[PDB]
């Protein structure tokens, strides 16, 4: 079974560095070439880098957003690959895939001639300066303007936590029909928020309870927010 | 150096549709592209190399054509399985690069999205900060444009937005736009509103309130 699986990606504070691994199996990893994509949350695949096989001398490459920043080692010996990340900035944060590359046609040589055939798990990197904390939850109450035609709207907004995640429920799970949970943005502060929100009947307002349960565990936080009409 | 274009971003389509996915190169690269599949929370599998051959393993339904700076990805007789994101990739030239992706999407037929706004609570103006909420509910398609306006003034920057996946049952999408100023900044203002523009309405829908009420 050919298998690549990373490792070794946390919280790192900018300016630091991070040593990002990836483990190979099932095949010999010094006769491919080996590379390094990236992909920030909720965006698309970047080419990082690239280390090439035994036959060329183990020679690497990198895109020019990290040349002079990030650095391949190989140790076939025991079949791993570091990508070594310094002075990471905030834009470096994404899940990091190692990926083996194949050659097709390889009588015509080392050219353009090259696919990627096996992606690993990925391991996420985070590049920040914000400390854990926990959020603060506020209720996005029902009103006037928060009704269509018999429909209400009614929420809670978590805000100002790090890091990920938090989890939400409504009244500890009774209420699941028309629970839109989003996913959370980041602040220009470092810190998360998101929303969670529900669509009720607007004749079930004050006769209906609607509690909000919310919890970060990082810093093992747990409100129940009560969400009252306006 | 070079730079892929993949259109369109978003596709929509049912069971035993056949899609076309077009990835364009800003300069010719002979047949140097690959197509790799991509579904939310895993990590991209391998698909087509050298613009039409197939990884082995791959179903026969998957097929691609193009040379020089135009290449097709085509899925015929859709299954429930391909629905995800495909991505191009050149290995003609360093450094090499990827296509910006695009979606497979479940069509259905067009919702127009129920559209709420939420003041800040008194609580969140007792530390600082007051956060104006506008949601739009359960729309289909997804393309959808927010405007926040205070005072009349466009607002540009000063909000995040996230949109949540598209439903497993009814297949439409949900929109949260959160508008934050610093209490100084929020008493300073009466009028706040979101207006949305989406394929669905007769015409734009503005949710406004007043500072007061």
């Known amino acids: 079974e050919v298998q690549l699986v990373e490792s070794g990606g946390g919280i790192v504070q900018p300016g630091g560095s991070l040593r990002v691994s990836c483990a190979a199996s099932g095949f010999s990893l010094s006769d491919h070439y080996m590379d390094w994509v990236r992909q920030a949350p909720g965006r698309g695949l970047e080419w990082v880098g690239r280390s090439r096989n035994k036959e060329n001398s183990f020679t690497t490459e990198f895109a020019a957003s990290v040349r002079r920043r990030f650095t391949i080692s190989r140790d076939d010996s025991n079949s791993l690959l570091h990508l070594q990340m310094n002075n990471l900035k905030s834009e470096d944060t994404a899940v990091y895939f190692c990926?083996?590359?194949?050659?097709?046609?390889?009588?015509?040589?080392?050219?353009?001639?090259?696919?990627?055939?096996?992606w690993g798990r990925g391991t996420l990197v985070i590049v920040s300066s914000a400390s854990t904390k926990g959020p603060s939850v506020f209720p996005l109450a029902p009103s006037s303007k928060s009704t269509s035609g018999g429909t209400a709207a009614l929420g809670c907004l978590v805000k100002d936590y790090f890091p990920e995640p938090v989890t939400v429920s409504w009244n500890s799970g009774v209420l699941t029909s028309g629970v839109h949970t989003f996913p959370a943005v980041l602040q220009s502060s470092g810190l998360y928020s998101l929303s969670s929100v529900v669509t009720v009947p607007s004749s079930s307002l004050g006769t209906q309870t609607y509690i909000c349960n919310v919890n970060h565990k990082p810093s093992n936080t747990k409100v129940d927010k009560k969400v009252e009409p306006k | 150096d070079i730079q892929m274009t993949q259109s369109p971003s978003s596709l929509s389509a049912s069971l035993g549709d056949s899609v076309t996915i077009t990835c364009r190169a800003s300069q010719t690269m002979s047949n140097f592209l690959n197509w790799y599949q991509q579904k939310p929370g895993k990590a991209p599998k391998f698909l087509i190399y050298?613009?039409?051959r197939l990884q082995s393993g791959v179903p026969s339904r998957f097929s691609g054509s193009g040379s020089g700076t135009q290449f097709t990805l085509t899925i015929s007789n859709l299954q429930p399985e391909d629905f995800a994101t495909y991505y191009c990739?050149?290995?003609?030239?360093?450094?090499?690069?990827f296509g910006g992706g695009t979606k497979v999407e479940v069509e259905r037929t067009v919702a127009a999205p129920s559209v709420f706004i939420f003041p800040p609570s008194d609580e969140q103006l007792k530390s600082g900060t007051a956060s104006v909420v506008c949601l739009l509910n359960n729309f289909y398609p997804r393309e959808a444009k927010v405007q926040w306006k205070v005072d009349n003034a466009l607002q540009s920057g000063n909000s995040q937005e996230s949109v949540t996946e598209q439903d497993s049952k009814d297949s439409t999408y949900s929109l949260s736009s959160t508008l934050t100023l610093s209490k100084a900044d929020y008493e300073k203002h009466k009028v706040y509103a979101c207006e949305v523009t989406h394929q669905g309405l007769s015409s734009p829908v503005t949710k406004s309130f007043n500072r007061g009420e």
């Open positions: 990739q050149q290995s003609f030239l360093f450094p090499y690069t």
């Open positions: 050298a613009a039409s």
């Open positions: 990926a083996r590359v194949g050659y097709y046609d390889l009588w015509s040589g080392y050219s353009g001639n090259w696919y990627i055939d096996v």
